């Protein structure tokens, strides 16, 4: 809203860099769309334009770093760990086996243009996997979402 905490701002700050490859401090339609579409999704240009236009308070056709915080802040407000995880878990779980492996997680992560190594992926799963079965389940997903 009109009052964002340093917590949510920092979260998007890191993600922002992951989205802003040129680190120009601004995100374009092609960028936000390219990264988003990389999430294994194939949204139409109309879907992206509307997405941006919604946050584009100036309708300049582009969103700056500040505007980015708005997009994430909009969803962060109604953060529905319930549906959010459900849909997200499905995206990461291509096979829909109910468990997220390193291969898959690494694949989706790489799609966002993020260069993660096997060690980083293992830590992500291991740190998120309470049982340490080398995979992340739905219950573990929400448990890992812990803001602390």
């Amino acid at each position: 809203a009109d009052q964002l905490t340093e917590e949510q701002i920092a979260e998007f700050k890191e993600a922002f860099s992951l989205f802003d490859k040129d680190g120009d401090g601004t995100i374009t339609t092609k960028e936000l769309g390219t990264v988003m579409r990389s999430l294994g999704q194939n949204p139409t240009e109309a879907e992206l334009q509307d997405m941006i236009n919604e946050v584009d308070a100036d309708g300049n056709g582009t969103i700056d770093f500040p505007e980015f915080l708005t997009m994430m802040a909009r969803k962060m407000k109604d953060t529905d760990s319930e549906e959010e995880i459900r849909e997200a878990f499905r995206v990461f779980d291509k096979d829909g086996n109910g468990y997220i492996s390193a291969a898959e997680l690494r694949h989706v992560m790489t799609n966002l243009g993020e260069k993660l190594t096997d060690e980083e992926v293992d830590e992500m799963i291991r740190e998120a996997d309470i049982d340490g079965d080398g995979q992340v389940n739905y219950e573990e997903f929400v448990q890992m979402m812990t803001a602390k």
Binding site: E11, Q41, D50, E120
Partner: peptide, 22 residues
């Protein structure tokens, strides 16, 4: 590590939410 989770997590969540509002 947790930051990465928020990234992909939020990315998919916001996408479904922001797009849905459309």
């Amino acid at each position: 590590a947790k930051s990465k989770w928020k990234q992909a997590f939020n990315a998919t969540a916001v996408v479904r939410h922001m797009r849905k509002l459309q």
